[PDB]
């Protein structure tokens, strides 16, 4: 299943319609970024403006004719709170030489893999550079998974407690450093069931195992 | 602060009129414009009045015009909409609503049903059970707004209360669930805690295996 | 007398993500438009007025925007709590119109249904009605299917199904399903099954009772 977009070219200088092209893009998606609205640019023609906005099955583009094409240019920095560098990015834009470029967040470019926008501020979502210019932003972001590594040892409670498994597990998504053994039934030794169940502190078991009783089943 | 409270609504014979009043507190009210705004079983939002804060001037759109008036009361700080004339098409939530343009707070609504039918009030019954679920079938009411708890409103987790459908009778039906520890069957009591106001019953009915 | 459309019924957006909600009025309206946000159970509150300004208290990721005849709420770094139906406005002249409303829901991994059944009460039978419920519980896709078989017979006409809205926290749907049948067609057959298909099944599962156990 996709979606069937009409991309509607206008010179409003003419104030006449160069083109109308059909693309197709994926279902859930309501803004069509402006890699695919120059990759479809009719000859001659540059990109002036868009909002992006998918409308009643129509995008509506600002084109212009006889004029420079040239790149703007953005380094994306992401970082997370305390300035530590998650990664850099640089995307690129071509339009009408002195119009506006506006880079927006997912469409055009996307956090680094594992994070999202950071709780702790307000900044923006959407970064204005001209055509044949180039500049920086900084995007502030924190990771999605919380989780910690946790050591564990299945251990046979009908067998004086021998070791039968263990290992280290990831546990506590959200991060409240408390977990809970649905977290991890995923790992129980395969011929045993888990009798030790319920919760269990994080932090206590980043270097001691936390030893979970299990039994033979049947 | 701000707060909107509407009554009146109940259920009408078509032809028939009813006065709904909003009691308004938290703001001057003789300052502002107010309106009120209708909701439709579709969910689609319909403005029907609004009225300027010295009440000089009153506006209504052409389907409710002639049948609807609106006013307030700038000493009780109320609002009123008197409706004559009912249509089955005027069955609706009614809203009142801050200011005369947009509307920048609004109140919880109250009930209006236009209808020939008369009230009938709910059967409870019970919908007995790692987890367990357990429910609640509230069944055979007519006007409209029933309200479903667990334990006074106390248990929230895990509590499913579904959309009311219409029967083939005409008459409404709904159920309640939720779920919980198996292992705390036989310890706590489960009581869902009916409201159908439209006929003044109120059912505590508790929910036990069996 | 301006009408206000939106032509999106229902749009899917996943956590973090884009959407932008579109309203086209038929007039000119400069700015005079608004938008309200609706959550399930709850009266339309206040988000944007003439047509870019957020009140106080509504949060940054809700973007308003456009003048004359298009207009856009944009929510940005879409939250699973940002569910609901959305409404825009036109307050340019009177008669105030409302669009029809654009209903926001959020994606989710596949989330298989948990299926229970319960059989009729005995006050309800004593009083002639046998109703018997369905429950499927907490699933993503909200597109499911309930078949009631009665003795491996699959019934029609005599059921009816129920919605929940998506669930804020996670964005989960459940339903009920009830089978209504006279007192006398009860208890003349023995087997009362349950049969569910659903994207996050392989086969459909199949839960039943025994009248009388
Ligand atoms: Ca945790």
């Known amino acids: 299943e996709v979606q069937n977009v009409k991309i509607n070219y206008y010179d409003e200088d003419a104030e006449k319609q160069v083109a109308e092209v059909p693309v197709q893009v994926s279902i859930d998606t309501s803004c069509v970024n402006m890699a695919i609205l120059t990759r479809y640019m009719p000859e001659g023609y540059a990109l002036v403006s868009s909002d992006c906005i998918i409308r009643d099955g129509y995008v509506y583009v600002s084109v212009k004719k006889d004029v420079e094409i040239r790149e703007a240019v953005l380094h994306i920095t992401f970082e997370t709170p305390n300035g530590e560098v998650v990664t850099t990015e640089t995307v690129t834009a071509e339009g009408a030489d002195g119009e506006d470029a506006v880079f927006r967040l997912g469409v055009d470019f996307n956090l680094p893999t594992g994070y999202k926008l950071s709780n702790d501020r307000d900044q923006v979502t959407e970064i204005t550079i001209p055509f044949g210019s180039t500049g920086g932003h900084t995007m502030v972001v924190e990771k999605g998974d919380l989780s910690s590594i946790v050591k564990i040892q299945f251990v046979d409670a009908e067998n004086n407690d021998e070791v039968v498994a263990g290992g280290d597990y990831f546990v506590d998504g959200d991060g409240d450093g408390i977990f809970h053994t649905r977290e991890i039934t995923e790992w129980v030794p395969e011929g045993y069931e888990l009798q030790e169940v319920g919760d269990f502190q994080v932090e206590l078991y980043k270097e001691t195992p936390l030893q979970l009783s299990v039994t033979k089943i049947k | 602060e701000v707060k909107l409270e509407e009554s009146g609504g109940d259920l009408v014979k078509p032809g028939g009129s009813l006065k709904l009043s909003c009691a308004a507190s938290?703001?001057?009210?003789?300052?502002?414009?107010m309106s009120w705004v209708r909701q439709t079983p579709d969910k689609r939002l319909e403005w029907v009045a609004t009225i300027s804060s010295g009440g000089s001037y009153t506006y209504y759109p052409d389907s409710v015009k002639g049948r609807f008036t609106i006013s307030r009361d700038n000493a009780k700080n109320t609002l009123y909409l008197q409706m004559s004339s009912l249509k089955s098409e005027d069955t609706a939530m009614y809203y009142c609503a801050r200011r005369g343009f947009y509307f920048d707070y609004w109140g919880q609504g109250t009930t209006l049903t236009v209808s020939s039918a008369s009230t009938k009030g709910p059967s409870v019954f019970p919908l007995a059970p790692g987890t367990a679920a357990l429910g609640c079938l509230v069944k055979d009411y007519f006007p409209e707004p029933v309200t479903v708890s667990w334990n006074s409103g106390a248990l929230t987790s895990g509590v499913h209360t579904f959309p009311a459908v219409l029967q083939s009778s005409g008459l409404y039906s709904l159920s309640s669930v939720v779920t919980v520890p198996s292992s705390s069957l036989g310890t706590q009591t489960y009581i869902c805690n009916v409201n159908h106001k439209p006929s003044n019953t109120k059912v505590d009915k508790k929910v036990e295996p069996k | 007398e301006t009408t206000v459309t939106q032509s999106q019924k229902f749009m899917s957006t996943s956590v973090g993500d884009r959407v932008s909600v579109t309203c086209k009025a038929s007039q000119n309206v400069g700015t005079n438009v608004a938008w309200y946000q609706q959550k399930p159970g709850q009266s339309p509150k206040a988000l944007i007025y003439s047509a870019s300004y957020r009140y106080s208290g509504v949060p940054d990721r809700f973007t308003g925007s456009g003048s004359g005849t298009d207009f856009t709420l944009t929510i940005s770094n879409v939250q699973s709590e940002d569910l609901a139906e959305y409404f825009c406005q036109q307050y340019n002249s009177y008669p105030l119109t409302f669009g029809q409303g654009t209903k926001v829901e959020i994606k989710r991994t596949v989330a298989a249904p948990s299926v229970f059944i319960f059989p009729p009460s005995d006050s309800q039978l004593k009083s002639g009605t046998a109703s018997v419920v369905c429950l499927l519980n907490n699933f993503y896709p909200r597109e499911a299917k309930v078949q009631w078989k009665v003795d491996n017979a699959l019934q029609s006409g005599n059921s009816q199904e129920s919605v929940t809205e998506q669930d804020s926290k996670d964005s989960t749907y459940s339903l009920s399903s009830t089978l209504t049948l006279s007192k006398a067609d009860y208890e003349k057959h023995k087997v009362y099954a349950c049969e569910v298909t659903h994207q996050g099944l392989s086969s459909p599962v199949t839960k039943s009772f025994n009248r009388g156990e």
């Open positions: 938290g703001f001057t009210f003789s300052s502002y414009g």
